[PDB]
Amino acid sequence: GXGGNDNXG
Amino acid sequence: GXGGNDNXG
Amino acid sequence: GXGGNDNXG
Amino acid sequence: GXGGNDNXG
Amino acid sequence: GXGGNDNXG
Amino acid sequence: GXGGNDNXG
Amino acid sequence: GXGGNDNXG
Amino acid sequence: GXGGNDNXG
Amino acid sequence: GXGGNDNXG
Amino acid sequence: GXGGNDNXG
Amino acid sequence: GXGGNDNXG
Amino acid sequence: GXGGNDNXG
Amino acid sequence: GXGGNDNXG
Amino acid sequence: GXGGNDNXG
Amino acid sequence: GXGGNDNXG
Amino acid sequence: GXGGNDNXG
Amino acid sequence: GXGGNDNXG
Amino acid sequence: GXGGNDNXG
Amino acid sequence: GXGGNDNXG
Amino acid sequence: GXGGNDNXG
Amino acid sequence: GXGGNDNXG
Amino acid sequence: GXGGNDNXG
Amino acid sequence: GXGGNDNXG
Amino acid sequence: GXGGNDNXG
Amino acid sequence: GXGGNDNXG
Amino acid sequence: GXGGNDNXG
Amino acid sequence: GXGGNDNXG
Amino acid sequence: GXGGNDNXG
Amino acid sequence: GXGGNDNXG
Amino acid sequence: GXGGNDNXG
Amino acid sequence: GXGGNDNXG
Amino acid sequence: GXGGNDNXG
Amino acid sequence: GXGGNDNXG
Amino acid sequence: GXGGNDNXG
Amino acid sequence: GXGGNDNXG
Amino acid sequence: GXGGNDNXG
Amino acid sequence: GXGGNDNXG
Amino acid sequence: GXGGNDNXG
Amino acid sequence: GXGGNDNXG
Amino acid sequence: GXGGNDNXG
Amino acid sequence: GXGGNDNXG
Amino acid sequence: GXGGNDNXG
Amino acid sequence: GXGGNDNXG
Amino acid sequence: GXGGNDNXG
Amino acid sequence: GXGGNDNXG
Amino acid sequence: GXGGNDNXG
Amino acid sequence: GXGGNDNXG
Amino acid sequence: GXGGNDNXG
Amino acid sequence: GXGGNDNXG
Amino acid sequence: GXGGNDNXG
Amino acid sequence: GXGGNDNXG
Amino acid sequence: GXGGNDNXG
Amino acid sequence: GXGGNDNXG
Amino acid sequence: GXGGNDNXG
């Protein structure tokens, strides 16, 4: 979707 | 969806 | 359609 | 269609 | 973490 | 982490 | 990480 | 179609 | 008018 | 008018 | 009008 | 989807 | 029982 | 039972 | 997805 | 995906 | 049971 | 994908 | 216009 | 216009 | 215009 | 014989 | 004989 | 004989 | 469920 | 008949 | 007939 | 489910 | 009949 | 000495 | 499921 | 001495 | 001494 | 006249 | 007249 | 007249 | 069989 | 068989 | 067989 | 074992 | 074993 | 083993 | 089982 | 099983 | 099994 | 230790 | 230890 | 230890 | 002593 | 002592 | 002592 | 996934 | 995946 | 995948 430091599994 | 440090599984 | 974090653990 | 993070763990 | 995974955004 | 994976965005 | 993988964007 | 991160773990 | 048009018919 | 139009018909 | 037109018919 | 340091599987 | 129509499952 | 139509599964 | 969807016709 | 979808016809 | 139409699976 | 889709015709 | 399915399983 | 399927499985 | 499938499996 | 003897383990 | 003897393990 | 003897392991 | 022993079915 | 909007999710 | 809106989720 | 022993089926 | 919009997800 | 079987079908 | 022993089927 | 079988079908 | 079988079909 | 058929005399 | 056929005399 | 055929006298 | 004829449709 | 003829349709 | 003829259609 | 008419219609 | 008419219709 | 008419229609 | 003019199915 | 004019299926 | 004019299928 | 019997079914 | 009986069913 | 019997079914 | 000894063990 | 000894063990 | 010894072991 | 590990046995 | 490892046994 | 390793045994 915008601009974060994200990481999902 | 915007701009957080998020991580879900 | 413009939804946010679409993520299934 | 313009959705955000499309990701299946 | 197992389970069927589908959705349109 | 297993499971069928499909979606249109 | 296993599972069928398909989607149109 | 213009979606974001299209990625199946 | 515009967005995802992921529709088999 | 615009947004997700994930609709099989 | 424009976007993804992933539609088999 | 824009501009983060992201990594999902 | 036969099946349905307009549906990934 | 036969099957459906307009659907990846 | 789960299973054993359309079956004892 | 799961399975055993259309079967005991 | 036969199969469907307009569908990767 | 899963499997055993169209079978006991 | 109708038939149907039948099986001693 | 209709037939159908039949099987002792 | 209809036939069908049949099998003792 | 009938059927569907040992199966939903 | 009938069928579908040892199967949904 | 019938069939579908040892199978969904 | 597994099966039995000492039995044609 | 034309918007001059910014970037959909 | 045209908005000049900002970015949908 | 596995199977039995000492049995034509 | 033409927008001069920016970049869809 | 015991295990068993397990399946989301 | 595997199979049995000492049996034509 | 025991294992077993397992399957999302 | 025991293993077993496993399959998402 | 259909139906599983077995018996020892 | 159909059906599995077995018996020891 | 169809059906598996076996027996020891 | 005594004049009749059992048969699905 | 005694004059009749069992047969699906 | 006694005059008849078992046969699917 | 010494039974009389052993016959399944 | 010494039974009489062993015959499946 | 010494049985009589061993015959499957 | 003895001596009649018999005929069963 | 003895001595009649018999005929079963 | 002895001595009749017999005929079964 | 020996009968001199006649003919079992 | 021996009968001299006649013919079992 | 020897009968002198007649003919088993 | 004698008769049918149809017994899997 | 004698008769059918249809027994898998 | 004698008869059918149809037994896999 | 957050430290754990879902797994049948 | 977050440290764990889903796996049947 | 995040350190783990899904794998049957």
Report the length, in residues, of chain AA.
9
Neighbouring residues of BB3: CB distance < 8 A, sequence distance ≥ 6: BA1, BA3, BA4, BA5
For AW1-9, the DSSP string reads --S------
Q: Are J9 and M7 an interchain contact pair (Cβ–Cβ within 8 Å)?
A: no
Chain AB residue with minimum CA distance to AI4: AB9
Q: Tokens representing AQ3?
A: 């001596």
- Gap between the Cα atoms of AN8 and AP8, Å rounded: 10
Determine the residue type at G9: G
C-beta of residue AW6 within 8 angstroms of C-beta of residue AN1: yes
Which CA distances in Å does I3 have to C1, I6, K3, AR4?
7, 9, 5, 84
Chain AX residue with minimum CA distance to AN3: AX4
Could you count the other beta carbons within 10 Å of the beta carbon of residue AP5? 20
Q: Are R6 and N9 an interchain contact pair (Cβ–Cβ within 8 Å)?
A: no
Tell me whether chains V and AW touch (3+ CB pairs under 8 A). no
Could you count the other beta carbons within 10 Å of the beta carbon of residue AZ1? 24
Chain F residue with minimum CA distance to G4: F4
Question: Which residues of chain Y neighbour W7 with C-beta distances below 8 Å?
Answer: none
Closest listed residue to residue AX2, CA positions, set AS2, AU2, AH6, Y6: AU2
Beta partners for residue AJ7, in sequence order: AI7
Tell me whether chains AO and D touch (3+ CB pairs under 8 A). no
Beta partners for residue AI8, in sequence order: AH8, AJ8
- Gap between the Cα atoms of AJ3 and AH4, Å rounded: 9
Å between AI6 CA and nearest CA of chain AX: 13
Determine the residue type at AF2: X
* Partners of chain AQ (3+ Cβ pairs below 8 A): AL, AN, AO, AR
DSSP category for residue AS3: S
C-beta of residue AT3 within 8 angstroms of C-beta of residue AV5: yes
- Gap between the Cα atoms of Z5 and AG7, Å rounded: 49
Question: Radius of gyration over alpha carbons of chain AF, in Å?
Answer: 9
E strands along D1-9, which residues? 6-8
Closest listed residue to residue AH4, CA positions, set AI6, W7, AE9, AE4: AI6
Could you count the other beta carbons within 10 Å of the beta carbon of residue AD3? 17
Encode chain Y in three state secondary structure. Answer: CCCCCCCCC
Residue numbers preceding breaks in chain J (C to N > 2.5 A): none
C-beta of residue R7 within 8 angstroms of C-beta of residue O6: no
Q: Classify residue M7 by burial, with Cβ atoms within 10 Å: 0-12, 13-18, 19+.
A: middle
Å between H1 CA and nearest CA of chain A: 15
Q: Write b or e for each residue in U1-9: b if 16 or more Cβ atoms lie within 10 A of its Cβ, otherwise e.
A: eeebbbbbb
C-beta of residue Z7 within 8 angstroms of C-beta of residue AC6: yes
Question: Which residues of chain Y neighbour AW6 with C-beta distances below 8 Å?
Answer: none
Q: Write b or e for each residue in O1-9: b if 16 or more Cβ atoms lie within 10 A of its Cβ, otherwise e.
A: bebbbbbeb
Q: Write b or e for each residue in AK1-9: b if 16 or more Cβ atoms lie within 10 A of its Cβ, otherwise e.
A: beeebebbe
Q: Classify residue AQ3 by burial, with Cβ atoms within 10 Å: 0-12, 13-18, 19+.
A: middle
Could you count the other beta carbons within 10 Å of the beta carbon of residue V2? 12
Neighbouring residues of AP4: CB distance < 8 A, sequence distance ≥ 6: AO3, AO4, AO5, AO6, AR1, AS1, AS2, AT9, AV9
Chain F residue with minimum CA distance to AF9: F3
Chain AX interface, best mutation among AJ6, AJ7, AJ8, by max AX CB count within 10 A: AJ8
The data reach a resolution, in angstroms, of: 3.4
For AX1-9, the DSSP string reads --S------
DSSP category for residue AL2: T
C-beta of residue N8 within 8 angstroms of C-beta of residue F7: no
C-beta of residue A1 within 8 angstroms of C-beta of residue H4: yes
Determine the residue type at AM4: G
For C1-9, the DSSP string reads ---S-EEE-
Q: Are D8 and F8 an interchain contact pair (Cβ–Cβ within 8 Å)?
A: no
Question: Which residues of chain AG neighbour G2 with C-beta distances below 8 Å?
Answer: 8
- Gap between the Cα atoms of AP8 and AJ3, Å rounded: 8
C-beta of residue A7 within 8 angstroms of C-beta of residue C5: no
Strand order in the sheet with AO6-8: AN6-8, AO6-8, AP6-8
Closest listed residue to residue S2, CA positions, set V6, AU8, U2: U2
Residue reference for tokens 């259609």: AM9
The dihedral sign for the CA sequence S2, S5, S6, T1: positive
Encode chain T in three state secondary structure. Answer: CCCCCEECC
Beta partners for residue AI6, in sequence order: AH6, AJ6
Chain W residue with minimum CA distance to S8: W2
Å between V8 CA and nearest CA of chain X: 10
Chains W & AB: contacts with CB separation below 8 Å: 8
Which residue of D1, D2, D7 is in closest CB contact with C7?
D7
Instruction: Give the rounded distance of the alpha carbon of Z7 from its chain centre.
Output: 7
The dihedral sign for the CA sequence M6, G3, P4, E1: negative
- Gap between the Cα atoms of AI5 and AK6, Å rounded: 19
